[PDB]
Design a protein around this ligand. Structure first.
Ligand SMILES: CC(=O)NC[C@H]1CC[N@H+](Cc2cc(Oc3cnc(N4CC[NH+](CC[C@@H](C)C(=O)[O-])CC4)nc3)nc(-c3cc(Cl)cc(Cl)c3)c2)CC1
Ligand SMILES: *[C@@H]1O[C@H](CO)[C@@H](O)[C@H](O)[C@H]1NC(C)=O
Ligand SMILES: [Ca+2]
Ligand SMILES: [Ca+2]
Ligand SMILES: [Ca+2]
Ligand SMILES: [Cl-]
Ligand code: NA
Ligand code: NA
Ligand code: NA
Ligand code: NA
Length: 471
């Protein structure tokens, strides 16, 4: 295998590292996987389709302009270079290799497009028309943004966008399901808690957080239980950043944030789909769970779950490992059809006060076609009132003892509107047997005499009843 000759490839430390602090992408390339035949679309502020490092891989069939309602996603050029982010992300996935320009994409032979959707009012329809763009041509969608990362917002896809997610994973990609890759958020300095973002909190999105070059949790990271894995991104000013294509036919060495991590994951997923084009949207999440690597990622919350995997709310199952992903994809057996077990927990509303614990022993739909012995995602769908929402911290403990943080305290969240059937999601009990006692904890983290009521707690289990590995 001959590694890329591009002038800035040596500066793409998260690929070309010889120190083991990288995404192990060269190993995938050396197995023959470069993204050939795979189609990725960047949902953002547009894509400079004539960029010298993107033109050779540019695919109009992966592109649209929902802001101006035309097929051409070219960015709006301004003095401050406002609409450059989509172009930066496109190059992370699929910048051309061995052409004397900038560096390379993770999947440097994949086809790449962009949806111009963020340069205008982002409505439910705009979101739905973007997520649902050409779903039998585009394999993988990359989205780096969502509701405001101000640490006080609770919002997610409205009706059309949620319908687009279910249509995508159900009928997209020939029935195998669109793969939606999401950044878990940039709200770290606002103490944001990312299950409050219904896009990254969705089971239908494969959610990605960031690690700095030295293996630390960056200032901008949000912790939450819905995150699945991690890719490198920026950190302090002694740590390197992401190197990629930039607006006006330039390169950049200063692409940053969790919003730079999701495209790298999308590229790794593109290599993996080249290795096995029959992978379903759920198969891809299984591969990520099984192959991601905690080693050398620093966090104070690494915990071993019930099947022996380390999980963190900052990192999910750890750093993506592209060589391992493509190796395991090749002979992967398609997972069984997805089951869903609905358990309405409360017999009466419960006063929260200073602290509430709800314990329930469940059989996970024993005797039914939705019996689950092998969990994938789990949700605690909660309806509650509270006088100051951000004073609440919420945890969910599985029968195997895995304590998922569903919500951390959010000091800026002064809302008195509570949670209205909010489906807090955790990935940390993946492959556990969910039969047994679940424990929900709601606590007032403030010394204030806060008050409210939990009126509904639905435990929703997804998964299967076959195919488990030895822990
Ligand atoms: C009841 C109803 O009908 N309820 C409609 C709302 C439902 C909730 N939704 C949330 C939402 C807001 C949002 O709002 C924005 C707007 N704009 C940005 N931008 C633009 C500026 N950019 C500058 C970057 C520069 C500084 C740089 O390069 O650093 C940052 C990102 N981000 C988020 N997006 C998304 C979204 C983003 C992507 Cl990607 C894909 C999809 Cl599907 C949805 C979603 C808004 C409409
Ligand atoms: C894809 O997987 C399905 C489900 O196991 C199987 O029926 C089908 O034959 C597979 N197709 C290919 C081309 O491998
Ligand atoms: Ca246009
Ligand atoms: Ca190049
Ligand atoms: Ca957030
Ligand atoms: Cl469902
Ligand atoms: Na965000
Ligand atoms: Na997700
Ligand atoms: Na444990
Ligand atoms: Na059990």
């Amino acid at each position: 295998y001959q590694e890329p000759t591009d002038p800035k490839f040596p500066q793409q430390w998260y690929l070309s590292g010889v120190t083991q602090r990288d995404l192990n992408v060269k190993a995938a390339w050396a197995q023959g996987y470069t993204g050939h035949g795979i189609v990725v679309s960047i949902l953002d502020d547009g894509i400079e389709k004539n960029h010298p490092d993107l033109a050779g891989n540019y695919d109009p069939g992966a592109s649209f302009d929902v802001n101006d309602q035309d097929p051409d996603p070219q960015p709006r050029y301004t003095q401050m270079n406002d609409n450059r982010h989509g172009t930066r992300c496109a190059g992370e996935v699929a910048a051309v290799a061995n052409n004397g320009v900038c560096g390379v994409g993770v999947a440097y032979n994949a086809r790449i497009g962009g949806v111009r959707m963020l340069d205008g009012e982002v409505t439910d329809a705009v979101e739905a028309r973007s997520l649902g763009l050409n779903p039998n041509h585009i394999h993988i969608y990359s989205a780096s943004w969502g509701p405001e990362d101000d640490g006080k917002t609770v919002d997610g896809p409205a009706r059309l966008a949620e319908e687009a997610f279910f249509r995508g994973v159900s009928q997209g990609r020939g029935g195998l399901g669109s793969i939606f890759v999401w950044a878990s958020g940039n709200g770290g300095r606002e103490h944001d808690s990312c299950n409050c973002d219904g896009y990254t909190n969705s089971i239908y999105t494969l959610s990605i957080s960031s690690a700095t070059q030295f293996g630390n949790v960056p200032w901008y990271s949000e912790a939450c239980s819905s995150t699945l894995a991690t890719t490198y991104s920026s950190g302090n000013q002694n740590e390197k950043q992401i190197v990629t294509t930039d607006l006006r036919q330039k390169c950049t060495e200063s692409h940053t944030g969790t919003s730079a991590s999701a495209p790298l994951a999308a590229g790794i997923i593109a290599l993996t789909l080249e290795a096995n084009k029959n992978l379903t949207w759920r198969d891809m999440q299984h591969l990520v769970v099984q192959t991601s690597k905690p080693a050398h990622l620093n966090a104070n919350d690494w915990a071993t779950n019930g099947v022996g995997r380390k999980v963190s709310h900052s990192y999910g199952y750890g750093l993506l490992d592209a060589g391992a992903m493509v190796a395991l994809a090749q002979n992967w057996t398609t997972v069984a059809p997805q089951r869903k077990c609905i358990i309405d927990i409360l017999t009466e509303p419960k006063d929260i006060g200073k602290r509430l614990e709800v314990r329930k022993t469940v059989t996970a739909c024993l005797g039914e076609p939705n019996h689950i012995t092998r969990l994938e995602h789990a949700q605690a769908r909660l309806t509650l009132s509270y006088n100051r929402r951000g004073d609440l911290a919420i945890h969910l403990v599985s029968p195997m003892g895995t304590r998922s943080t569903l919500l951390a305290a959010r000091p800026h969240d002064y809302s008195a509107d509570g949670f209205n059937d909010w489906a807090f999601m955790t990935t940390h009990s993946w492959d556990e047997d969910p039969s047994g006692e679940w424990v929900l904890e709601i606590e007032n983290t403030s010394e204030a005499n806060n008050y409210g009521t939990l009126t509904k707690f639905t435990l929703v289990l997804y998964g299967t009843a076959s195919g488990s590995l030895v822990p």
